[PDB]
Amino acid sequence: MNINIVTIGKLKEKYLKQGIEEYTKRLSAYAKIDIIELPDEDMKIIKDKEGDRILSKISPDAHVIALAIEGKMKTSEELADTIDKLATYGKSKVTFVIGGSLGLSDTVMKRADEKLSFSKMTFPHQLMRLILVEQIYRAFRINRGEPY
Amino acid sequence: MNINIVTIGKLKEKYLKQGIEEYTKRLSAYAKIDIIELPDEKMKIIKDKEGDRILSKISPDAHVIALAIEGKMKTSEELADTIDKLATYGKSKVTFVIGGSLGLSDTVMKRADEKLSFSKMTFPHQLMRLILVEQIYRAFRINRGEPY
């Protein structure tokens, strides 16, 4: 399959860039991974604009998973389950959406096939990216039946 | 005043290390924190073996927060709160516990004064360390009203 992560803002701190580099390399063995890093920025007109800027990158064929706190908190086994089930049917494209400070436009949310929540806590989106990649790498390991 | 982090596994990845150092640095300004790493291997006897290891580093008069997937999930607000409300319970020594890949022994859990959860999904311990430290900073930052 081929995974796409559409995020907001460019990674600043090097330790995160390196960490993501690593997992991306690892996940690369199980499927294709591409991280679309697009530029950022009462005032929801910016949220909405960013919302169309994201949709511009989303494939009509991709099963979209937007990261949001009002989302379903799946287990690692459940995220793995979801991906396996998508492979079972023709769903070879999976795209994850990580909003920015502002958040995600109602339009992006409407397009999303599902909302996933990683925690009740707040994490900087730079870090959320690193967690997300690792987690997807973990989902595939689970699915390939590897102990990890 | 004093926050300890007792974890299983000597962290190598200087990317994580870089991140942890960087965050643990801003923290020493509100309280100094020390991370205790224990050597790890790579059935169950090994997990318990790691339990006493963890316990021999935990003062009996310390408030122990065990990070368990099954633990209670707080928001950065509920975490900032429980950290401040400890200073008043006559608990100046607080220790966070992050188990190895196997998990936390039975003795560690029962020694735990509270069980904290960061998500329903599993994170690698090495990565959980950077997340715990980042969250603690956020808590302090939140506690002093200072915006983060």
What is the residue-wise DSSP string for A75-143? -HHHHHHHHHHHHHTT--EEEEEE--SS---HHHHHH-SEEE---SS---HHHHHHHHHHHHHHHHHHH
Start-to-end CA span in chain B (Å): 21
Q: What is the CA radius of gyration of chain A?
A: 15
Q: Say which residue the tokens 């009002």 belong to.
A: A70
- Which residues does B107 contact at the CB level (< 8 Å), separation at least 6? B48, B51, B52, B55
DSSP class of residue A40 equals P
The shortest CB-CB distance from B18 to any of A15, A22, A121 is to A15
B-chain residues near A14 (CB < 8 A): 15, 18
Contact in structure between A30 and A80 (CB atoms under 8 Å): no
The CATH number of A2-148, from 3.40.50.620, 3.40.309.10, 3.90.1310.10, 3.40.1280.10, is 3.40.1280.10
The shortest CB-CB distance from B127 to any of A119, A124, A131 is to A131
- Alpha-carbon dihedral of residues B142, B140, A67, A5, nearest 10 degrees? 120
Resolution (A): 2.5
Can you tell me the distance from the alpha carbon of B68 to that of B71, in angstroms, rounded to the nearest whole number?
5
- Annotated ligand binding at A96? The verdict is no
* SS3 call for A66: strand
Q: Which of A30, A36, A82, A80 is nearest to A58 (CA)?
A: A36
Closest approach of A7 to chain B, Cα-based (Å):
20
Can you tell me the distance from the alpha carbon of B80 to that of A18, in angstroms, rounded to the nearest whole number?
30
The shortest CB-CB distance from A19 to any of B16, B22, B135 is to B16
Can you tell me the distance from the alpha carbon of A120 to that of A123, in angstroms, rounded to the nearest whole number?
10
Contact in structure between A58 and A5 (CB atoms under 8 Å): no
B-chain residues near A79 (CB < 8 A): 121
C-alpha atoms less than 13 angstroms from C-alpha of B121 in its C-beta half-sphere: 27
CA A15 to chain centre: 20
Q: Which two tokens stand for residue B112?
A: 């735990």
- Which residues does A78 contact at the CB level (< 8 Å), separation at least 6? B120
Q: Which of A141, A124, A104, A120 is nearest to A23 (CA)?
A: A141
* Burial of B138: CB neighbours in 10 Å, binned 0-12, 13-18, 19+: buried
Tell me which of A15, A65, A117 to substitute to probe the interface with B (most B C-beta atoms closer than 10 Å). A15
Contact in structure between B97 and B53 (CB atoms under 8 Å): no
Q: What is the CA radius of gyration of chain B?
A: 15
CA dihedral sign of residues B4, B6, B7, B13: positive
Interchain CB contact of B56 with A (< 8 Å): no
The shortest CB-CB distance from B75 to any of A13, A14, A120 is to A120
Q: Which of B40, B20, B29, B12 is nearest to B99 (CA)?
A: B40
Any bridge partners for residue A7, and if so which?
A37, A98
Closest approach of A14 to chain B, Cα-based (Å):
8
Buried-state track A88-114, b at ≥16 Cβ within 10 A, e below 16: eeebebbbbbbbbebbbbeebbebbee
Entry field: residues in chain A: 148
B-chain residues near A75 (CB < 8 A): 120-122
Determined by which method?
Answer: X-ray
Phi, psi of A110 (to 5 degrees): -70, -35
* SS3 call for A51: helix
Q: Say which residue the tokens 């996933």 belong to.
A: A116
Q: Which two tokens stand for residue B31?
A: 């309280």
Phi, psi of B51 (to 5 degrees): -65, -55
Any bridge partners for residue A4, and if so which?
A34, A95
Contact in structure between B125 and B99 (CB atoms under 8 Å): yes
Phi, psi of A28 (to 5 degrees): -55, -25
- Chain-chain contact of B119 with A79 (C-beta, under 8 angstroms): no
Can you tell me the distance from the alpha carbon of A53 to that of A55, in angstroms, rounded to the nearest whole number?
6
Can you tell me the distance from the alpha carbon of B71 to that of B87, in angstroms, rounded to the nearest whole number?
22
Helix B125-143 to helix B14-27 angle, to the nearest 10 degrees?
Answer: 20
DSSP string, B6-70: EEES----HHHHHHHHHHHHHHTTTSEEEEEEE------HHHHHHHHHHHTTS-TTSEEEEEEEE
- Chain-chain contact of B118 with A121 (C-beta, under 8 angstroms): yes
Can you tell me the distance from the alpha carbon of B8 to that of A100, in angstroms, rounded to the nearest whole number?
34
Q: Say which residue the tokens 């960087």 belong to.
A: B22
Domain boundaries, chain B: 2-148
